[PDB]
Every structure is written in structure tokens, then in C-alpha cells.
Amino acid sequence: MSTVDFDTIFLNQSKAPGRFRITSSGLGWKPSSQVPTKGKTDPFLLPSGDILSVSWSRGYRGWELRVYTRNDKVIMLDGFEQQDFQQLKNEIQRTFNVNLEHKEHSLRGWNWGKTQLTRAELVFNVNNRPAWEIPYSEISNSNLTGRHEISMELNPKTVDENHYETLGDELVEVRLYVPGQKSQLFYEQLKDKADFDTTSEAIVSFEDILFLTPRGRFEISMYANNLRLRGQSYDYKIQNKNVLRIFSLPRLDDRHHLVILQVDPPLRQGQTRYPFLVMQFDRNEELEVELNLSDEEYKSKYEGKLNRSYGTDSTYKILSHCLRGLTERRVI
Amino acid sequence: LKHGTYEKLDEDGLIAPGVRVSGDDIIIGKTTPIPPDTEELGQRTKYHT
Amino acid sequence: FKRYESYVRESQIPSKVKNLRISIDPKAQTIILPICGRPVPFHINSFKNGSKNEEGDYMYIRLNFNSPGMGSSVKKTELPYEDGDDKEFVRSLTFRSTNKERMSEVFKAITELKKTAVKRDQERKTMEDVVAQAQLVEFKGRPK
Amino acid sequence: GNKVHIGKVPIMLRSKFCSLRTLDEVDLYKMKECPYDMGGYFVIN
Amino acid sequence: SKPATLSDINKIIFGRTAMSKYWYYPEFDDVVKGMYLRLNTGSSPYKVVEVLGSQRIKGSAYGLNSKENNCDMYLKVAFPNQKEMVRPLFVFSDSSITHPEFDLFLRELDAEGLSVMDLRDVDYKYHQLKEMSSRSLSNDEVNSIVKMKQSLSSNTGFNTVLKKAQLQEELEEARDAHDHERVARIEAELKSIGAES
Amino acid sequence: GDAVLGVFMDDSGDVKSQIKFDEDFQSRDFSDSLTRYIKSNNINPDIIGISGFNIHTKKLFDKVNELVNEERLTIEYDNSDKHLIRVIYVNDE
Amino acid sequence: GVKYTCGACAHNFSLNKSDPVRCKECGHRVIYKARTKRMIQFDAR
Ligand SMILES: [Zn+2]
């Protein structure tokens, strides 16, 4: 029985090379014994009955063999040479009766196209060619971020007792823009496919705040240890310790209210800096906000510093109280 | 220069222990700067400073 | 739409790509991004703006791309994408890395490549509507 | 008004304010001082 | 941009004696960064490691060359095939890197998918080492190095005598101030330090 | 202890630059410095004069002639067999 | 270029006529030159 084997093959973007083997019972992959990989040394085995289809395409480390399973999982094997294609094609056809499909990918560098939800992967097509595909098993969560905007979070692969160390830069989040009255139907189908569960983060967020300095509009997301300013062109992370002083000052126009943060070190945009952040509110702007905190964490850490819910009071008062409670700085 | 011999001095202008010395030999080499003359006319750096 | 391309053949993609990391090709103005083991090229023209945030040990860099709806300041006359109501767009990709220094250098090099591309396009436009003039004929005697 | 410095007084060797009044016999050798030296003189320049 | 040959790497050989001669320099941390040197594996086939950085470790003073050669500097290196390692300075050997050693280092780099230092970078390292070795230290740098070695100083007869004299002076100062609490502590410290032979 | 002095004058008759050669005239450094002075500074003298008080100047003349023949220091001609810059002795009463 | 010896810890080193006169490891201000490498011969009389 001619066992065909390939050395230096990687499984699912593994850091360690392994030996790949084709047998009448299925596919086998085993890590090469030369790397101390804190990790089970157990061979990966895929039964012949679980193989649905196999595609051949360009990967990072040479050519990639992508195996589609009947259980809607995608297995990626990378590290093949271009010459291996003829041997692999003949052996896969002989052993599994499956055609090895050659899949050419779009290299145009365009960020527009059509998404296509295939059984096991989300495919992005550019000029009728696949630019990239994401297996549904790699998608952790999906969330509608606007009327035409879909954000997909990918499982950050850190340390799991069942996965080989990954080598390189990891994709964490993909945002798609789907025009037309269409993004909600696209989201529903994707969400239903893998039962994605929505999550909520950030103790409190304030959207669309006008800053006079730096000039622009920013979302303010507050955390236990840090404040985030999210701006179209600039994201800032300020530690609560770096906030020295909070000023809450009425403007003489008797229509706007100023909230001013002194930050050390001063925020940077290039040459000159921003030691003071100047926010401008309308006095008639009212906001209702519930804190994203568990009842046990609220009672233990924030009782008497923050309110569990703020009623419909002026936005600048709620913001000034939240800043006081999280930074422990007195409002002037 | 003194009429003695300067060949017993090291690179730093100090003689080293264990060296036999005689009268008028130079045991400490010291120089004091002097404003240069018009010898920079045609002297190839070989002018007394 | 000003048509552009990153690579025509897979051979054109540099051999330096073998690292499963973000590789930048200044000659082809291309930002190759590792999407699930795929060397996906993204032309600097399609790229819009970038935001870098070092969260913990990983450096989370969100690379934004041109998307319709109050996007780039470029006038309607020239669009960085082809017109299409049925066209869907990659609006942003966020990557993380344990190596902070290199990831900061990669971000600087993407930003520099964009500045050089914009400067070259301005220089072209300052020469575009300019009509190719005839060559000045020098006076064969003493000129006034 | 506090401790203003008015000058430096030379110290007689082996006197009460000398550093060699202490140090015993062993440390007197580490400091390259002869134990037979009796003191009673100053060191100027 | 050309790959470095054996002679280019040999030009930047930094021996263990040179390490002891220059490890206390403030710039030595960046000087040793990225260098290639022969290392005793111990577990012995000598191999080459790449310096990912250095980390001072207090309380880990070790004999570098002799008994008096106490050192607190540590080098964080790593084999290409193997993982990151924090090693003391004396592990490296003054002997030159052999052809099979450099060949194995190249094979491990190829297995990992890494490259060799550029010839321009090799020249930059060589110039950095030449500047550092021929540099003239300042008075402040000398004081800093002396204080660092004093912190590393376990014991020295001259320094012990100086410390005992300073303690005696402090004790007489406390006595003249009628401080009956400090003087007891100073007497206990003097008793502990003393009892010579 | 006899350094070589160089003085260049333009067609205007006004001194433009004077240089000192403090190395030995038989060293490679002397020839390299003279070539740098001749070429880099755009001096481009039309003729080079050499004179002295004794026969030692003859060796300098020979060395200069060899340098001219070696470096092909042709005269710059304002806008093609470019001609070499002549080196001769000068009467000096 | 020329060796030196510290006056307290007896540590050998060298100077380049530009370093401060100081022992590198204990900071002593007094150093001594090392013996010459020439041959020294005596008449044994
Ligand atoms: Zn010393």
C-alpha cells in the first residue's frame, strides 16, 4: 500500500512543521519532533468518510490544501510546493474519489466586491474571484454597528489545550459595509448559521461629544482603569491615573457648558500637544444612561461613587459624575 | 630640549619601574605650550609649538 | 474610477510574504494582510486611514479602507472605487501582534507609502490640465 | 542661621579627632600605616 | 543588504574577557543587542544564539572570570530552533565560531524562516563596538560604575575598614547628640561587622 | 621641513585661494590632496608654474608632471580632444 | 597602551592618556605603573 507523505507541512497555520500522510483510512498530520511545543504530541487524524471536497490554492508558505469536511469544518494544510500538485491530485482522486479543485484568488488590491455565505466559510469575491475566505468556526461574534455596517469579531487564538501555537499577525475584527435597502438580512443569515451571541462592554459610553480641543467629534468609552476617546481619524487611550483635574464650567453664552480634562502626559497629534481636553455640551442636552456593571461589582467597588442608573439629566452632569467616580478626582 | 636622553620614557611621558637610570636622564617628560611663530610659512607641520 | 492593480501573477508577490504577517510592497504600493492564511493584497489607493492602539501585550491596528457615504475628501469626479449600488466594501480590518516595535514600524511605513502616493497624485494633477506646450526658440543674437 | 562653615583646622595624627585613633592593629596595616608610628605631627601639603 | 559571511561576523567577535571589560557601560546594553556569539549549550556542542536583549538581575551576582569578577548583567538570548533563554555572561566562550556552528545556525534560521544580518548592519555593529571600546569614560560615568560595583561589592578589606571608620564617626556624632537609641543600633552593627583575624 | 605652498590666481589677476600641503611631496597623500584641490574646487587652472631656489624643485616638477600624466587633468573648456594642463618652469627674478 | 595597577585592590588596567586617573572598579585616585618588560640583570655582588 503506497503511503504518500509530505514533510514540512503546517496544520491550521501551526508554528511547528509536521509530517502529512495520505492513507486509505483518511488524512493524518503529526508535528515534527524537533520543536519543544508545550502541547499534546498526538497526531491529527481526519477519517476518509468526513472529506467532502478539496481545494488547492496559494497560501503564505507556498501552496495550501484546503479540505472541506461534511461537519462544516475547514482544515488548512500549507507548505506544499507547486510540483506536489500532480501527485496530490492523483492520490486524492485514487484514495477518496474527490476532485482536487484549483482555486485562483483575486490579487487586484480592491476592497470592494460581493460577499457570499458558503456552507462552511464566508467568501469575499473581487471581480468574480475569491479575495479571501473566513471559516465560520473562526468567527466568535457578529454585531450590526450601523444601518449598512456589519462587524465580525474573530476568536483571538491565545492558549487553548487543543490548538497548536499560531505564527504571525492575527486578524481580530472585520468590518463590512453592505449598501442598499440588505445588511440586516445578511447579518441574520450569518448569525443563524453559527448562533452568534451578542455581548456588551464598557461601563459607560457617550456618543458624538463635541471637542473644542482637540477640534473634532469623539465617542467617550469609560472603563475601570482607563478612558477611551474614539475619533474618525484618531483613537486615544487615557489611563484614569493620568487625569489630574476635571473642570465643569458654564460658558458665558448661557447655552453651552464646558467640561475640561487636564491630562498628564499631554495627548499628542504630532508636534504641539493637548494638556487640556475641552468638551462642549448643550445645557438642554439630556441623556439617560444605565451602567454596564454586575450588582456584586457595583456594591463592592462603586457604591456611593456612581449611580446604578442616571435619570434623564443634563449630559455634562452625568459625564462629570462618572469621571469623578472612575478617576477619584474632584470636579472643579 | 635637555641634553639628556628621552629614550627611556614611555608613551605617557613617565619612565617605568625596573629601568636603570643614570645622571641627567629624563625620568618625567613634560611640555608647556608656546604661541606658534611664523614658521607655518613653509614648515610641513614641523614647527615648534 | 482610476483603475489600479496590486499584482497580476502570484509570482509577482514577493517571497518575503512567507511569515503569516503584514508585509508591505512599496514598489507595487500594496499592503498584504494575513486573512486566515491568505496573502490578500490591499492597494494603498483602496486604503483610507489607520489607527494604532497597544492594548495589553498585543498591538491592535485598525486599517480603514475607502467606503461610500461621507468618506474621503476626494471630489465625485474621481472615485477610488468603481460605482456600484450592489458592491459591498471591506470597511476596516483589525490585526494584533505580540511584537510592538515591528508593528509600529509597519504602521509608519504604511503611512509614509500613503503620503508618497498622495504627493505623486498632486504632482500629476498640477501637470495634468497643463497642455503640452511647444519648446521655446532661443534668439540666435544678443537677447533683450 | 545654622551651621556656617568658617574654615578647616589641621588634625594632629593619632589624636582624638584623627581617623587612626580607632581601627585596632589589623586595620592599621590595611591603611598602609606603620603600627610603630606614634603620631603627634600634622600633614600639610 | 548583502548576506554576511563568516569573516564579517568574526570581525565583531566580542570575547568573554571583552564582556567583562565592557559589560558595565550604559551603551553596552544596545551594543550587545543583535550580536552573534559562541555559546556553551551545556546540555557540549557550542552553538550561536541571537541576543534579544539584556536584563539586570539583582541578587544573582556570579563569578564572571575569577572569584572577584562578580556580575549582575544577564543576556536574554535565543536559539532559532529553541526558545528564549536568559543566560549569564560567562556561558559564552572566547573561542571562535566554527564553520559547522555557523552552518547549523543558518539551518535553524532557515527552518524558522529568518534571515541573516545585513552587511550594512554588520558594519554598523562593528562601528558601534569600535566606538564603545575606544571611548573615554567621563567622571560621572566612573562614579556611576563605582557605585554599581559597590552595590555588587560583597566585601573588600579596604572597603570594610572604610565602612567601620564611617560607622565609628557616626557613632561619636550620635554620642555627642545624647541619642541613646541610635547608638545601640550602631554598636550592634559595629559588633556584627568586626571580629577580624 | 619644507611644505609645498599653492597659490591660484584667475584671469582677473586677483588671488582666489591659497592652500598648504603639509605632508611629504612623495607621499600618496600629497598627490591625492593636490588632485582634490585641482578637481573638486572647480579651480581649473590653465597652466601650472613650478619654481624654486635649488635642484630639489626638479623632483617636485617631475612628480607634478607624472601626476598630470596619470590623472588626465584636462583643462575645462567653456561650451573633443581635451588638452592637458601644462606644467613648466618659471623665471623668477 | 600602558598598564597600570590600583593602589588598593591591585587591579590591572590600561589608560589612553584621556581617561580620568581612576581605578575602574573601586574608584581609587592613586594608581601605579607596571614593571618594564626589559631584561633586568644584577651582578650578585
Ligand atoms: Zn582599585
* SS3 labels along chain E: CCECCHHHHHHCCCCHHHHHHHCCCCCHHHHHCCCEEEEECCCCCEEEEEEEEECCCCCCCEECCCCCCEECCEEEEECCCCCEEEEEHHHECCCCCCHHHHHHHHHHHHHHCCCCCEHHHHHHHHHHHHHHHCCCCCHHHHHHHHHHHHHHCCCCHHHHHHHHHHHHHHHHHHHHCCCCCHHHHHHHHHHHHCCCC
Closest C-alpha among A72, A74, A71, A79 to residue A20: A79
Closest C-alpha among A120, A125, A53 to residue A92: A53
The alpha carbon torsion through A164, A165, A168, A170 (nearest 10 deg) reads 80
- Unique residue bearing C-alpha cell 547549523: E104
Whether the Cβ atoms of residue B10 and residue B30 lie closer than 8 Å to each other = no
In this structure, are strands E62-63 and E46-54 parallel, antiparallel, or unpaired?
unpaired
Burial C35-60 (b: 16+ CB within 10 A, else e): bbbbbbbbbbbbbbbbbbbeeeebbb
Burial G7-33 (b: 16+ CB within 10 A, else e): bbbebeeebeeebeebbbbbbbeebeb
Determine how many CB atoms are found less than 10 A away from the CB of residue F75.
Answer: 13
What is A248-310 written as a DSSP string? EEE-TTSSEEEEEEEEEEEEESSSSEEEEEEEEEETT-EEEEE----HHHIIIIITTTS-SEE
Query: What is the rounded radius of gyration, in angstroms, for the C-alpha atoms of chain E?
Result: 23
Whether the Cβ atoms of residue G6 and residue G23 lie closer than 8 Å to each other = yes
| CA dihedral for A242, A248, A253, A255, sign (positive or negative) | positive
Determine how many CB atoms are found less than 10 A away from the CB of residue F22.
Answer: 16
Amino acid found at A181? Q
Name residue A56's beta-bridge partners. A65, A102
Expressed in Å, this structure's resolution amounts to: 3.9
Closest residue in B to F18 (Cα) is B41
- Unique residue bearing C-alpha cell 563568516: E6
Closest C-alpha among B43, B9, B47, B46 to residue B25: B9
For residue A214, say if its preceding peptide bond is cis, omega within 30 degrees of 0: yes
Name residue E173's beta-bridge partners. none
| Cβ contact B43–F1 (<8 Å) | yes
Alpha-carbon span E164 to D21, nearest angstrom: 13
| Cβ contact E161–D27 (<8 Å) | yes
Question: In chain E, after which residues does the backbone break, taking C–N over 2.5 angstroms as a break?
Answer: 43
Helix (H) or strand (E) holding A87: helix A84-96
Please list, in sequence order, all residues whose beta carbon lies within 8 angstroms of the beta carbon of residue E80, skipping any fewer than 6 positions away. E50, E105, E108, E109, E111, E112, E114
Amino acid found at E106? L
The CA distances from residue C44 to A110, A232, B32, in Å, are 10, 19, 67
Closest C-alpha among A229, A223, A327 to residue A278: A229
Query: What is the rounded radius of gyration, in angstroms, for the C-alpha atoms of chain B?
Result: 15
Please list, in sequence order, all residues whose beta carbon lies within 8 angstroms of the beta carbon of residue E178, skipping any fewer than 6 positions away. none
Whether the Cβ atoms of residue C40 and residue A131 lie closer than 8 Å to each other = yes
Query: What is the rounded radius of gyration, in angstroms, for the C-alpha atoms of chain F?
Result: 13
Alpha-carbon span E18 to E136, nearest angstrom: 16
Alpha-carbon span A93 to A81, nearest angstrom: 19
DSSP secondary-structure letter at A241? G
Burial C122-143 (b: 16+ CB within 10 A, else e): eeeeeeeeeeeeeeeeeeeeee
Helix (H) or strand (E) holding A321: helix A315-327
Alpha-carbon span E190 to A191, nearest angstrom: 77
Determine how many CB atoms are found less than 10 A away from the CB of residue E82.
Answer: 15
- The three three-digit cell numbers of residue A165, written as one number: 501555537
Please list, in sequence order, all residues whose beta carbon lies within 8 angstroms of the beta carbon of residue B12, skipping any fewer than 6 positions away. G1, G2, G15, G17
Q: Is A186 helix (H, G, I), strand (E, B) or coil?
A: helix
Among E158, E168, E197, the residue with its CB nearest the CB of D22 is E168
Number of domains present in the structure of chain G = 1
Question: What does the angle CA D17 – CA D19 – CA D25 come to, to the nearest 5 degrees?
Answer: 125
Whether the Cβ atoms of residue A279 and residue A258 lie closer than 8 Å to each other = yes
Closest C-alpha among E34, E11, E14 to residue E22: E14
Determine how many CB atoms are found less than 10 A away from the CB of residue F87.
Answer: 17
- The burial of A68, by beta-carbon neighbours within 10 Å (0-12 exposed, 13-18 middle, 19 or more buried), is given as buried
The CA distances from residue F12 to A149, F38, F77, in Å, are 79, 19, 17
Determine how many CB atoms are found less than 10 A away from the CB of residue A111.
Answer: 30
The alpha carbon torsion through A142, A144, A145, A149 (nearest 10 deg) reads 100
Whether the Cβ atoms of residue A225 and residue A239 lie closer than 8 Å to each other = yes
- The three three-digit cell numbers of residue F42, written as one number: 572647480
Alpha-carbon span C109 to F74, nearest angstrom: 47
- Measured between beta carbons, the chain E residues lying within 8 angstroms of D28 are none
Instruction: Read off φ and ψ for residue E92, nearest 5 degrees.
Output: -65, 150
Closest C-alpha among E61, E55, E63, E56 to residue E16: E63
- The three three-digit cell numbers of residue C8, written as one number: 497580476
Whether the Cβ atoms of residue D15 and residue E158 lie closer than 8 Å to each other = no
- The three three-digit cell numbers of residue A92, written as one number: 486524492
Whether the Cβ atoms of residue A176 and residue C88 lie closer than 8 Å to each other = yes
Helix (H) or strand (E) holding A64: strand A63-69
Closest C-alpha among E132, E117, E124 to residue E37: E117
Instruction: Read off φ and ψ for residue A171, nearest 5 degrees.
Output: -75, 130
Burial A317-330 (b: 16+ CB within 10 A, else e): bbbbbbbbbbbebe
- Measured between beta carbons, the chain G residues lying within 8 angstroms of E134 are 16
Please list, in sequence order, all residues whose beta carbon lies within 8 angstroms of the beta carbon of residue E139, skipping any fewer than 6 positions away. G20, G22
Amino acid found at F5? L
G26 assigned ligand-binding residue: yes
Please list, in sequence order, all residues whose beta carbon lies within 8 angstroms of the beta carbon of residue A283, skipping any fewer than 6 positions away. A250, A254, A255, A256, A257, A314, A316
Q: Is C143 helix (H, G, I), strand (E, B) or coil?
A: coil
Closest C-alpha among E129, E133, E119, E95 to residue E8: E119
Determine how many CB atoms are found less than 10 A away from the CB of residue D39.
Answer: 12
| CA dihedral for F44, F50, F56, F61, sign (positive or negative) | positive
Alpha-carbon span A320 to A316, nearest angstrom: 6
- The three three-digit cell numbers of residue C102, written as one number: 515591528
Residues in chain F: 93
Alpha-carbon span E74 to E89, nearest angstrom: 6
Suggest the residue from E134, E137, E148 to mutate for an interface test with chain G (most G CBs closer than 10 A): E137
Whether the Cβ atoms of residue A277 and residue A228 lie closer than 8 Å to each other = no
Query: Is A36 an interface residue toward E (CB < 8 Å)?
Result: yes
Helix (H) or strand (E) holding A84: helix A84-96
Question: In chain F, after which residues does the backbone break, taking C–N over 2.5 angstroms as a break?
Answer: 79
Closest C-alpha among A161, A285, A58 to residue C34: A58
- The three three-digit cell numbers of residue F41, written as one number: 574646487
Residue G25 belongs to domain with CATH number: 2.20.28.30
Whether the Cβ atoms of residue E173 and residue D3 lie closer than 8 Å to each other = no
- Would you put residue A270 in left (φ > 0), alpha (ψ -120 to 50) or beta? left
Please list, in sequence order, all residues whose beta carbon lies within 8 angstroms of the beta carbon of residue E106, skipping any fewer than 6 positions away. E116
G25 assigned ligand-binding residue: yes
- Unique residue bearing C-alpha cell 552587511: E119
> How much of chain D is in helix, strand and coil states, percent to nearest 5?
10, 0, 90
- Containing domain of residue G45, as a range? 1-45
DSSP secondary-structure letter at B15? B
G9 assigned ligand-binding residue: yes
Whether the Cβ atoms of residue A83 and residue A91 lie closer than 8 Å to each other = no
Name residue E87's beta-bridge partners. E75
Residues in chain C: 144
- The three three-digit cell numbers of residue A197, written as one number: 451571541
| Cβ contact B42–F24 (<8 Å) | no
Among A58, A138, A156, the residue with its CB nearest the CB of C96 is A156
Alpha-carbon span E141 to E147, nearest angstrom: 10
| Cβ contact B18–G35 (<8 Å) | yes
Name residue A124's beta-bridge partners. A115, A132
G36 assigned ligand-binding residue: no
Alpha-carbon span C114 to C42, nearest angstrom: 12
Closest residue in E to G17 (Cα) is E136
Chains F and G in direct contact, meaning 3 or more beta-carbon pairs closer than 8 angstroms? no
Whether the Cβ atoms of residue E146 and residue E45 lie closer than 8 Å to each other = no
- Measured between beta carbons, the chain B residues lying within 8 angstroms of G40 are 18, 20
Q: Is A195 helix (H, G, I), strand (E, B) or coil?
A: coil
Name residue A28's beta-bridge partners. A21, A45
Whether the Cβ atoms of residue A229 and residue A236 lie closer than 8 Å to each other = yes
- The three three-digit cell numbers of residue B32, written as one number: 608647556
Closest C-alpha among A51, A47, A30, A28 to residue A39: A30
DSSP secondary-structure letter at A137? G
Whether the Cβ atoms of residue D21 and residue D33 lie closer than 8 Å to each other = no
- The three three-digit cell numbers of residue E41, written as one number: 549549550
Whether the Cβ atoms of residue C33 and residue C93 lie closer than 8 Å to each other = yes
Helix (H) or strand (E) holding A318: helix A315-327
Whether the Cβ atoms of residue B15 and residue B29 lie closer than 8 Å to each other = no
Closest C-alpha among C17, C4, C91, C77 to residue C44: C4
- Unique residue bearing C-alpha cell 468609552: A221
Suggest the residue from A8, A9, A34 to mutate for an interface test with chain E (most E CBs closer than 10 A): A34
Amino acid found at C30? T
Alpha-carbon span C1 to C100, nearest angstrom: 37
Helix (H) or strand (E) holding A315: helix A315-327
Alpha-carbon span A205 to A290, nearest angstrom: 10
- The three three-digit cell numbers of residue E101, written as one number: 556552528
Instruction: Read off φ and ψ for residue E124, nearest 5 degrees.
Output: -65, -45
Strands (E), A192-240: 204-213, 215-222, 226-230, 235-239
Query: What is the rounded radius of gyration, in angstroms, for the C-alpha atoms of chain C?
Result: 20
Closest residue in A to E80 (Cα) is A35
Which contacts qualify for A227-231: CB closer than 8 Å, 24 or more apart? A227/A323, A227/A326, A227/A327, A228/A202, A229/A277
G18 assigned ligand-binding residue: no
Closest C-alpha among A11, A66, A63, A8 to residue A34: A8
Alpha-carbon span C58 to C96, nearest angstrom: 5
Suggest the residue from B8, B12, B28, B31 to mutate for an interface test with chain G (most G CBs closer than 10 A): B12
Whether the Cβ atoms of residue C22 and residue C93 lie closer than 8 Å to each other = no
Alpha helical stretches, state H, chain C: 100-128
What is chain F written as a DSSP string? --PEEEEEE-TTSSEEEEEEE-S-TTSHHHHHHHHHHHHTT----SEEEE--SSTHHHHHHHHHHHHHHHHT-BPP-----PPBPEEEE----
